[PDB]
Write a protein that binds this ligand. Structure first.
Ligand SMILES: Nc1nc2c(ncn2[C@@H]2O[C@H](COP(=O)(O)OP(=O)(O)OP(=O)(O)O)[C@@H](O)[C@H]2O)c(=O)[nH]1
Ligand SMILES: Nc1nc2c(ncn2[C@@H]2O[C@H](COP(=O)(O)OP(=O)(O)O)[C@@H](O)[C@H]2O)c(=O)[nH]1
Ligand SMILES: [Mg+2]
Lengths: 160, 432, 430, 50, 217
C-alpha cells in the first residue's frame, strides 16, 4: 500500500531512471490506484518512461488505459508503439481492433509483429492479417476458415 | 664493421634492454637523446648514426602488451630509440607459451620482422642478433621461439645469441614457468648458436651477499645483468688488439650443436656503500671465477667437466698477469676437462674497465672478468626445470590452457623428450 | 588486459554488487557523485579496469544492473552510491522469477536477456582491451541463478575468448526459508562448471556462522553478511585494481589458479574478520598469516584440513615487513606441507599492496583452490537428492518448458565435480 | 520502512521446530494442498579448450 | 686406442650432428693419420659445426693431404669453417696455402683476417710481405697486431718503413708488436731508421729508437 503511493509520487521525479523504474514497479504490483498516474506518464517527455508506463498498463489490464494506449500507438518512438500494441492485446478490448489493424502497416518490423499477436489475442482482423513478422500473422489466424488458402520460419505455424 | 641487432622480448627482455642501453650509452659517452658531446668509433656496430651526430641503438623492443614499453616511450630514453623500434600488442600471452607462439604472437610476428628488416638494411655487414627474454613469461618463451624460427628462414647465415632469464620462485609470477622454459628451450635449440642463462636466484643472492640489498628489485638485478652482458659484448663495441671477435669466441666456446649453454661467472661485484675498496688484482678476479658464489646459474662445475673455458677481461689487465693467473688455475684439481677436448683457457682483453652507473649499486673497479665455461654442470639447471615439468605434466596440470591456445599435448611430449636428450648429451660428454 | 565488465543480477547480485562499488569507490577516492577526490595517483593508476572516464573528471562504474523485479533497481539507485551508476545500464522488467531458476533461465529472464546483451555489447565495444566479465549473483533464487547463468551462457557465445568470472552466493537453510533453493543451486553449479573460468564460492552458511559464532552477532542481518562479502570482493580484486606483478589480470589469475578446467571454484578468506560498527589494535604479520589460512576465516563452509590446496593466492595489504611476509608464507607451507599438493611446485603465490582497506592499517585476503570445497557441493547435493528422489516441486520448473532430464544432468555434473576434487585430494607425485 | 543493511534473515531451520526433512515434508504437503527445452550437457565446456 | 680411433671414424657418418662434431674434435686430439681421409670427407658435411671441427682436426694432425681440401674450405659460407681452415693451413705450413691465405686477409670476418695474417707469418713466405704491409692499415687493431707480428716473423726488409709508421699507431699493443718486429728484422736498414727517429721522432717511437741504439752499435 505505502509502496504503491511511493512509486506514484516517483512518476513526477526529475530523474528519468526513477520515473521509468516507478512505472515498471507499478506494473509489477498491478494495483488499480496507479492506472490514472500511469495514463499521465504516457505523455512523458522521455520515451523510456512512456514505454514503461504503456507496458505497466497492459500488466494491470484496466480498460481506462484503452483510449490513451490507442493514442500511444501513433507515437514517434517504436518502443512506445510496440509496448502500447502489446498492452492493448493484453487488455483485449474491442476498441483496439481498428487501431491495431493500422499498426500492421507500420514502418518498423517490431511494431508490425507486435500488433499481429495482439489481434490474435483479441474477426475484423482476419483480412488485414492475411495481407519473421509473418509467423505472428500465421499464429494469430490460427488463434482466431478464410485463412486456409493464404497458407498455400513461416512453415512451422501452418497446422491450426 | 659488423653490426649486431639486439631484440628485447617481453617484460624481462625489455627491462634488461633498458639497463643494457643505459650502460652502453654511459660506456660510449652517448646521452639519452643520442648526442655524443665528446677516433675509436667501434660502437657503430651497436648504434647507427643519423643526421648531425644522432646515435640510435640498433635494437627492437617487442611485447604483447603495452605497459612496459610505454614506460620506455615516456621515460629517460624516449628520444634514444626511433618510435618504430618499440613494438607493442594489447593482450599479453598470460604466462602461456602457446599464446606467445601461436594465437597472440602470430598477429604481431610480421610487423616485428618488417621492423627488424629496416634495421638489417641499414647494416653494411650484419654479424648477428642478440635476443633478450625470460623463460617464464608467455611472450619471453613463446614469442622468442616464433621469432627465432622466422629469423632462421629470413637470416640463416647470421649468429643468434640469447640472454635468457632462467626462473626463480623468489621472483616467479607463474606456476607454469617450468612448462614455458622447456617449451621455449626445445623450439629454440636448433635456431640459436649460444645462450647465456641468468638464474634469477643466483643474481638475487649476489645482490644480497655482495651488495647488501635485503630485497633486490628488478632494477638492482638488471643493472648487474647488464655488466655481465656488457663484458660479453665489449669486443664488438670497442677496438683492441687483445680481444676475441665473435667467430673466434663462438667457435671455441660453443663448437658443438645443442650443448651451447655456457655458465657465466663474473668478478668483482663490489658495493658502492663500501667505505674504502682495495682494488683486486688479475689473480684475485681470476680466482673468484672459480668461486661458485659468483656464478650466474646455480650449479657445481667442480663436479662436472669442461669442454671449453673463456676468460673475458676488461680494464687495467696486462697479458703477463693473465698468463700468470692461468698458470695458477692450471694446478687446480677441481677444473677437469673432458678427455677428447683441448685443456686450455681462451683469453680476451678489453681496455675499458667497467663503467659506473650513477645511482647504481656497484663501486668503481679497475679491472673485471667474465668467465664463460662450456661445462656439463649446466645440466643440473635443466634437471631442476625438468623435474618440476614432470611433477605437473604427470597430472596434465594447466595443459588445457596451452591446448586451448593452438598447441597440442604432443608438443609438450616432444619438448620434454628433447630435454631428456639434452640431459643425456651432457651426461655422455661428461663421462669419466 | 584493461577493462572488466561487471554484471549484477537479481536481489543478491545487486545488493552485493552495490556494496562492492561502495567499497572500491572509497578505496579509489571516487565520491558518491562520481568525482575523484583522493590523494594518491596509485588510486587512479588502474582505475580504468572498473571505471569509465566521463567528462567533468567523473568515473562511472562499468556495471550493468539487471533484475526482472524493478524494486531492486529502486533500491540500488536510492543507496549511498546509487548515483554513480550509468542510468542506461539499469536493465529491468516488470515481473519476477518467483525464486524459480526455470523462470529466470527460460521464460521471464529469456524475454529480458537481449536488452542486457545490448548494454553489455555497448560497454564491450567501447573497451580498448576487454579482460572479460565479473558477475555477482545468488545461486538460490530465480534471477541471479537462472538469468545470471543464461547471461553467462549468452556472453560466452559472443565473447568466447574473454574470462568469465563470478561471485556466486551459495544458499543455506540457516539464512533462507525457500525449499527449492538446492534445485536452483544445482542447476546453476552445472552452468558454472562448464561456462566460468573462476567462481568465488561465497557461502551464506559460512557468512552466517562467521556473524553468529566469531563476530558474536546473535541476530545477524543481510547487511552483516554483506559486510563480509564486500570485504572479500575488495581483497580478491586488489591485484586487478592496483599496480603489481602477480595475478594482475583475470587471465593470469586463472592460468595460476586453475590446473583443471572444471576445478575453478575458489574458497575465499580474509583477516581480520570485522563487524559493521566496531573499530579494530593492528595485527602482526604472523597473526595475519595464521588467521587468513584458518577455517573460521573462510567464506565457504569447508574445513581446509579435510582437503589439499591445488593452488593458493595470498594478498597482504598495508605497510608491513616483506621479510616477515616471506618468512610466514614459507613457514605456513613447511609446517603444514601435507595440506598442499606436491605435484604443483610453487603453487602458493603472494602479493603485497601498499594501500590497506578502510578502517584497517594491515590486512590479508586468501584465495584457495582447495579440494575441501567438495564439502560445499556435497551439502547442496544432499539437499537436492532429498527433494529430487520425491520429485518435490518439480512441476514449477517443468511447467516453464524445462526438461526433467536437466535436473539429472546437473546432479550428475555436480556429483562428478565432487568426485574429481577427491581424485586430486588422493593424487600422489610418486 | 527499514534500511537495506537491517534487512532481516528469514531462516528455514526452526531451532526447536525443524532441522532434517521436518521443514521439507511440511512444505511438500502444503504444496499438495493447492516443447521440452534443450539443456547444457556434461563436458560441453571442456570441449572449448581444444 | 686403435679401436678408439676407428670408433670416432665410424661416428663421422652418424645421424646426429653433435656426434659427428665430437668425433671430428676427438680425432684431432688423438692426431692419428688413419683419420685424415674420413676428416677430408667431413669438410663437405651439410652442417657447418662438423665442417669446422674437421678443419681444426686436420691442422692438429698436420698431414699435407688436407692442404687442397682446406684451401677450398677457406671459401666457405660459414666464418667458423674459414677461421678453422686458415688456422690449420698455417699449422701445416705448406706453401700452397700462401696465395689463398693472402686473399683471406681481405675477409669480411675479423677472426679470419687475424688468423690468416698469423698463418702467413708461420709459413714465412716472401709473397705475403706486400699484402701484410696493407693489413698494417686495417681498421681492426688485432689484425694490425698480427700483421706487424707476421712481418717480424718473415723478416723481410720491405716491411721496415711500414713498421716504423706502425710505431705511431693509436693502439699500444700494435706499437709494441711493430717495435718487436723491427728488432726481429734488424740490420743497417732498421739501425739507420732508428738513428733518424732518435732525433726527429717523438713519444714511444723516439723511445724505441733510443732503446734500439743502446744495444745495437
Ligand atoms: N631479471 C629479471 N627477471 C625478470 C624481469 N621481469 C620479469 N622477470 C622474470 O621473468 C619471468 C616472467 O616473464 P615476463 O618477462 O614477466 O613475461 P613476458 O615475456 O612479458 O610474458 P607475458 O606477460 O606472459 O606475455 C619471471 O621468472 C620473472 O621473475 C626483469 O626485469 N628482470
Ligand atoms: N549474502 C546475501 N545473500 C542474499 C542477499 N539477498 C538474497 N540473498 C540470498 O540469495 C538467495 C536467493 O535470493 P535472491 O537473490 O533474492 O533471488 P533473485 O532476486 O531471484 O536472484 C538466498 O539464499 C538468499 O539468502 C544479500 O543481500 N546477501
Ligand atoms: Mg608481460
Amino acid at each position: 500500500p505505502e509502496k504503491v503511493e511511493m512509486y506514484i509520487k516517483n512518476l513526477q521525479d526529475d530523474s528519468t531512471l526513477v520515473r521509468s523504474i516507478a512505472a515498471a514497479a507499478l506494473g509489477k504490483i498491478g494495483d488499480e490506484r496507479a492506472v490514472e498516474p500511469l495514463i499521465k506518464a504516457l505523455k512523458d517527455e522521455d520515451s523510456r518512461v512512456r514505454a514503461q508506463a504503456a507496458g505497466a498498463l497492459g500488466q494491470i489490464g484496466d480498460e481506462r488505459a484503452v483510449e490513451p494506449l490507442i493514442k500511444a500507438l501513433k507515437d514517434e518512438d517504436p518502443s512506445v508503439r510496440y509496448r502500447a500494441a502489446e498492452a492493448l492485446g493484453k487488455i483485449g478490448d474491442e476498441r483496439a481492433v481498428e487501431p491495431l489493424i493500422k499498426a500492421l502497416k507500420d514502418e518498423d518490423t517490431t511494431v508490425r509483429r507486435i500488433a499481429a499477436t495482439a489481434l490474435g489475442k483479441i474477426e475484423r482482423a482476419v483480412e488485414p492479417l492475411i495481407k519473421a513478422v509473418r509467423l505472428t500473422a500465421a499464429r494469430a489466424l490460427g488463434e482466431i476458415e478464410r485463412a486456409v488458402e493464404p497458407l498455400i520460419a513461416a512453415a512451422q505455424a501452418l497446422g491450426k | 664493421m659488423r653490426e649486431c641487432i639486439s631484440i628485447h622480448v617481453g617484460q624481462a627482455g625489455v627491462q634488461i634492454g633498458n639497463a643494457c642501453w643505459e650502460l652502453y650509452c654511459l660506456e660510449h659517452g652517448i646521452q639519452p637523446d643520442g648526442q655524443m658531446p665528446s677516433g675509436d668509433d667501434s660502437f657503430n656496430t651497436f648504434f647507427s648514426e643519423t643526421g648531425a651526430g644522432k646515435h640510435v641503438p640498433r635494437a627492437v623492443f617487442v611485447d604483447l602488451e603495452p605497459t612496459v614499453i610505454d614506460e620506455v616511450r615516456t621515460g629517460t630514453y624516449r628520444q634514444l630509440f626511433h618510435p618504430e623500434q618499440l613494438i607493442t600488442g594489447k593482450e599479453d600471452a598470460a604466462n602461456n607459451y602457446a599464446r606467445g607462439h601461436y594465437t597472440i604472437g602470430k598477429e604481431i610476428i610480421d610487423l616485428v620482422l618488417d621492423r627488424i628488416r629496416k634495421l638489417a638494411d641499414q647494416c653494411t655487414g650484419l654479424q648477428g642478433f642478440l635476443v633478450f627474454h625470460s623463460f617464464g613469461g608467455g611472450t619471453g618463451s613463446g614469442f622468442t621461439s616464433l621469432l627465432m624460427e622466422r629469423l632462421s628462414v629470413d637470416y640463416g647465415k647470421k649468429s643468434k645469441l640469447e640472454f635468457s632469464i632462467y626462473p626463480a620462485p623468489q621472483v616467479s609470477t607463474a606456476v607454469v614457468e617450468p612448462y614455458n622454459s622447456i617449451l621455449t628451450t626445445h623450439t629454440t635449440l636448433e635456431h640459436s648458436d649460444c645462450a647465456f642463462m641468468v638464474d634469477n636466484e643466483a643474481i638475487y643472492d649476489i645482490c644480497r651477499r655482495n651488495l647488501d640489498i635485503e630485497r633486490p628489485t628488478y632494477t638492482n638485478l638488471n643493472r648487474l645483468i647488464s655488466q655481465i652482458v656488457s663484458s660479453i659484448t665489449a669486443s664488438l663495441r670497442f677496438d683492441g688488439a687483445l680481444n676475441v671477435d665473435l667467430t673466434e669466441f663462438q667457435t671455441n666456446l660453443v663448437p658443438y650443436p645443442r650443448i651451447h649453454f655456457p655458465l657465466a661467472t663474473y668478478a668483482p661485484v663490489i658495493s658502492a656503500e663500501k667505505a674504502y675498496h682495495e682494488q683486486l688484482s688479475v689473480a684475485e678476479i681470476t680466482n673468484a671465477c672459480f668461486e661458485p658464489a659468483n656464478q650466474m646459474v646455480k650449479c657445481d662445475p667442480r663436479h662436472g667437466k669442461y669442454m671449453a673455458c673463456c676468460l673475458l677481461y676488461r680494464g687495467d689487465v696486462v697479458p703477463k698477469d693473465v698468463n700468470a693467473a692461468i698458470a695458477t688455475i692450471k694446478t687446480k684439481r677441481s677444473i677437469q676437462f673432458v678427455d677428447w677436448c683441448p685443456t686450455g683457457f681462451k683469453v680476451g682483453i678489453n681496455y675499458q674497465p667497467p663503467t659506473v652507473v650513477p645511482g647504481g649499486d656497484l663501486a668503481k673497479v679497475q679491472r673485471a672478468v667474465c668467465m664463460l665455461s662450456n661445462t656439463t654442470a649446466i645440466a643440473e639447471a635443466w634437471a631442476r626445470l625438468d623435474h618440476k615439468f614432470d611433477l605437473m605434466y604427470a597430472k596434465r596440470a594447466f595443459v588445457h590452457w596451452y591446448v586451448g591456445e593452438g598447441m597440442e599435448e604432443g608438443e609438450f611430449s616432444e619438448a620434454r623428450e628433447d630435454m631428456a636428450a639434452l640431459e643425456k648429451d651432457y651426461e655422455e660428454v661428461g663421462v669419466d | 588486459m584493461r577493462e572488466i565488465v561487471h554484471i549484477q543480477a537479481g536481489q543478491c547480485g545487486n545488493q552485493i554488487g552495490a556494496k562492492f562499488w561502495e567499497v572500491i569507490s572509497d578505496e579509489h577516492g571516487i565520491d558518491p557523485t562520481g568525482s575523484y577526490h583522493g590523494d594518491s595517483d596509485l588510486q587512479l593508476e588502474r582505475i580504468n579496469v572498473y571505471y569509465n572516464e566521463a567528462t567533468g573528471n567523473k568515473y562511472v562504474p562499468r556495471a550493468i544492473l539487471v533484475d526482472l523485479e524493478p524494486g531492486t533497481m529502486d533500491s540500488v539507485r536510492s543507496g549511498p552510491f546509487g548515483q554513480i551508476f550509468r542510468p542506461d545500464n539499469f536493465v529491468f522488467g516488470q515481473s519476477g522469477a518467483g525464486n524459480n531458476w526455470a523462470k529466470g533461465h527460460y521464460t521471464e529472464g529469456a524475454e529480458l536477456v537481449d536488452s542486457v546483451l545490448d548494454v553489455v555489447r555497448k560497454e564491450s565495444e567501447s573497451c580498448d582491451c576487454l579482460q572479460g566479465f565479473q558477475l555477482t549473483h545468488s545461486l538460490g533464487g530465480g534471477t541471479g541463478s537462472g538469468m545470471g547463468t543464461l547471461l553467462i551462457s549468452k556472453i560466452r557465445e559472443e565473447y568466447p575468448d574473454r574470462i568469465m568470472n563470478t561471485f556466486s552466493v551459495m544458499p543455506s537453510p540457516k539464512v533462507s526459508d525457500t525449499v527449492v533453493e538446492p534445485y536452483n543451486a544445482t542447476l546453476s553449479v552445472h552452468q558454472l562448471v562448464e561456462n566460468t573460468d573462476e567462481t568465488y564460492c561465497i557461502d551464506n552458511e559460512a557468512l552466517y556462522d562467521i556473524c553468529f559464532r566469531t563476530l558474536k552477532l546473535t541476530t545477524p542481518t543481510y547487511g552483516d553478511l554483506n559486510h563480509l562479502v564486500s570485504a572479500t570482493m575488495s581483497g580478491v580484486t586488489t591485484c586487478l585494481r592496483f599496480p603489481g606483478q602477480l595475478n594482475a589480470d583475470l587471465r593470469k589469475l586463472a592460468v595460476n589458479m586453475v590446473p583443471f578446467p572444471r576445478l575453478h571454484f575458489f574458497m575465499p578468506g580474509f583477516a581480520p574478520l570485522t563487524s559493521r560498527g566496531s573499530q579494530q589494535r593492528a595485527l602482526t604479520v604472523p597473526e595475519l598469516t595464521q588467521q587468513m589460512f584458518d577455517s573460521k576465516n573462510m567464506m565457504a563452509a569447508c574445513d581446509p584440513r579435510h582437503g589439499r590446496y591445488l593452488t593458493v593466492a595470498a594478498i597482504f595489504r598495508g605497510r608491513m615487513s616483506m621479510k616477515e611476509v616471506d618468512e610466514q608464507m614459507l613457514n605456513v607451507q613447511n609446517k603444514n606441507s601435507s595440506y598442499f599438493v606436491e605435484w604443483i611446485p610453487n603453487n602458493v603465490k603472494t602479493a603485497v599492496c601498499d594501500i590497506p582497506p578502510r578502517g584497517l592499517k594491515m590486512s590479508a585476503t586468501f584465495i584457495g583452490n582447495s579440494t575441501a570445497i567438495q564439502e560445499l557441493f556435497k551439502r547442496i547435493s544432499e539437499q537436492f537428492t532429498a527433494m529430487f528422489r520425491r520429485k518435490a516441486f518439480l512441476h514449477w520448473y517443468t511447467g516453464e518448458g524445462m526438461d526433467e532430464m536437466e535436473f539429472t544432468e546437473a546432479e550428475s555434473n555436480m556429483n562428478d565435480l565432487v568426485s574429481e576434487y577427491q581424485q586430486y585430494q588422493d593424487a600422489t607425485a610418486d | 520502512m527499514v534500511n537495506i543493511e537491517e534487512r532481516p534473515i528469514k531462516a528455514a531451520i526452526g531451532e526447536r521446530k525443524q532441522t532434517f526433512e521436518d521443514y521439507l515434508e511440511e512444505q511438500i504437503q502444503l504444496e499438495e494442498q493447492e516443447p521440452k527445452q534443450p539443456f547444457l550437457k556434461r563436458g560441453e565446456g571442456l570441449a572449448r579448450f581444444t
